[PDB]
DNA sequence: TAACCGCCAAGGGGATTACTCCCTAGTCTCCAGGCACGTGTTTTTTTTTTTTTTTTTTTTTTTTTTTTTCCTTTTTTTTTTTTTTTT
């Protein structure tokens, strides 16, 4: 345990695999808007 | 070789005369099918509404989110200014 210390009761397996990062990050993601702009013809918000 | 003619012989039935009889000509008189007139009820034609399939039209196709790229005219005809040549 990394808390405690304690033992882990079940055994784990472990040992080194190959991993790949996706492009799918939050920062690219993330979106907030409270008031903004408005369209020329339908006063609605944008897309995007 | 038997048609035809001449001669002879025989017989069969149509013509003739008379008697009869019976069926039809003629004339009333009653009445009934034959026929003139009217029309029908099936037959064909025309509409009428439906039927049944084919064809055409129209509308539809889960939602949300994030990046680029290209384009957002173009040739073709008409006009208008400019430049060069001539008298």
Redesign the pocket.
């Known amino acids: 345990n990394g808390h405690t210390g304690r033992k882990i009761n079940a055994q784990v397996f472990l040992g080194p695999t190959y991993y790949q990062r996706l492009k799918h990050m939050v920062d690219?993601?993330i979106?907030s808007r409270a008031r903004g702009p408005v369209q020329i013809l339908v006063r609605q918000p944008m897309?995007?």
């Open positions: 690219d993601k979106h897309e995007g």
